[PDB]
Design a protein around this ligand. Structure first.
Ligand SMILES: [Ca+2]
Ligand SMILES: [Ca+2]
Lengths: 155, 155
């Protein structure tokens, strides 16, 4: 059982970097294996180019406030959709090499990606885009446990 | 522009091989690049196992009756759905390495797939199942051209 909160820290309509911020909480009674957890951010690439994802910072925060830095365990891959919509033709899929999300604990991921030539994106035609000053409950981003959708609405 | 006709040549409710038969007609005025066309057959795996697809026979038939064998250009892959329904948790996606479908021409595909342990399937709970003696207009199978849905209803 999971709860996903999210926001984009870069609100510029035209920009050369998209900054997705994820906060995933294990609201269940049993621990979660992060290597089985994947997250997706849907958008339109606006000119297909190879892209790169970077995790500025990621950490597992326990229910008692314990801090475990896992920045280098977060990986990002770009998937071109086999069936697209007018505001979603590509998605960034976030994965973890390992780690355990214990009951009540949560993981914060401060992400960022860009095209390899640093050309612009347009964020107003991106399905998952959500400008906010903090993590909000947003269902236009999805989460999966072993390939099964457990949060959000796919486009 | 396309038209998809279809039928299953194996009607057995319990069986260890599913036989989808596709007939795709280029009803438009311009030729179609087959490497840009994909087709889907939705069903419930009834016990997750790796699966294999075989094209028994495939051919491009021209409006003048011309015959061009393309059996080895037809590929099939199995995709497990992230979100499933009571009659769809997996889909066979059919692709073509190449070929061009001229206006008025159609391509016939006699396919078959099975689990790698040859265990049974149940066809009564499969979204795309359509038993018939010949190809019928069926919208429970989908076709995508350039990653865009151009035929059928997805579950
Ligand atoms: Ca965009
Ligand atoms: Ca079945």
């Amino acid at each position: 059982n999971l709860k996903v909160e999210f926001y984009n820290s870069n609100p510029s309509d035209t920009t050369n970097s998209i900054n997705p911020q994820f906060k995933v909480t294990n609201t269940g009674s049993s621990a979660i294996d992060l290597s089985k957890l994947t997250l997706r951010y849907y958008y339109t690439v606006d000119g297909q180019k190879d892209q790169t994802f970077w995790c500025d910072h990621a950490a597992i925060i326990g229910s008692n406030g314990s801090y475990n830095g896992i920045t280098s365990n977060v990986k990002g891959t770009f998937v071109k959709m086999s069936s697209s919509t007018n505001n979603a033709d590509t998605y960034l899929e976030i994965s973890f090499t390992g780690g355990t999300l214990e009951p009540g604990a949560h993981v914060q991921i401060q992400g960022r990606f860009a095209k390899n030539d640093w050309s612009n994106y347009t964020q107003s035609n991106d399905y998952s885009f959500k400008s906010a000053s903090q993590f909000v409950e947003w269902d236009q981003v999805t989460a999966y446990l072993n390939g099964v959708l457990v949060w959000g609405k796919e486009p």
